[PDB]
Design a protein that fits this description.
The protein is built from five helices and no strands. By secondary structure, the protein is an all-alpha fold. It is classed as structural genomics, unknown function.
């Protein structure tokens, strides 16, 4: 899977779990284009991880041993945090 077939990556962003759908999909739709090529490649590889791990990482119950994956998880968190609803 590579970086310029956006429709295929989009599909790969549909997860079996609700909390992930709301995290990974919107990140992709709003943020993917803004990534470096290296960031895109890493994000694609992140998408091959299992949902139990992605959910733990995104909730910060630990983190990936792979530092590239750790950096991508953190970029998702940062971008999602800034885009989402500001709640009083």
């Amino acid at each position: 899977m590579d970086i310029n077939n956006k429709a295929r990556i989009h599909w790969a962003c549909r997860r079996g779990m609700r909390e992930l759908d709301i995290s990974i999909m919107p990140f992709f739709e709003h943020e993917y284009d803004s990534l470096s090529d290296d960031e895109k490649r890493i994000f694609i590889r992140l998408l091959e991880c299992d949902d139990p791990d992605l959910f733990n990482w995104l909730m910060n119950h630990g983190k990936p041993a792979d530092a590239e994956l750790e950096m991508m998880v953190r970029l998702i968190q940062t971008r999602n945090r800034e885009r989402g609803p500001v709640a009083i």
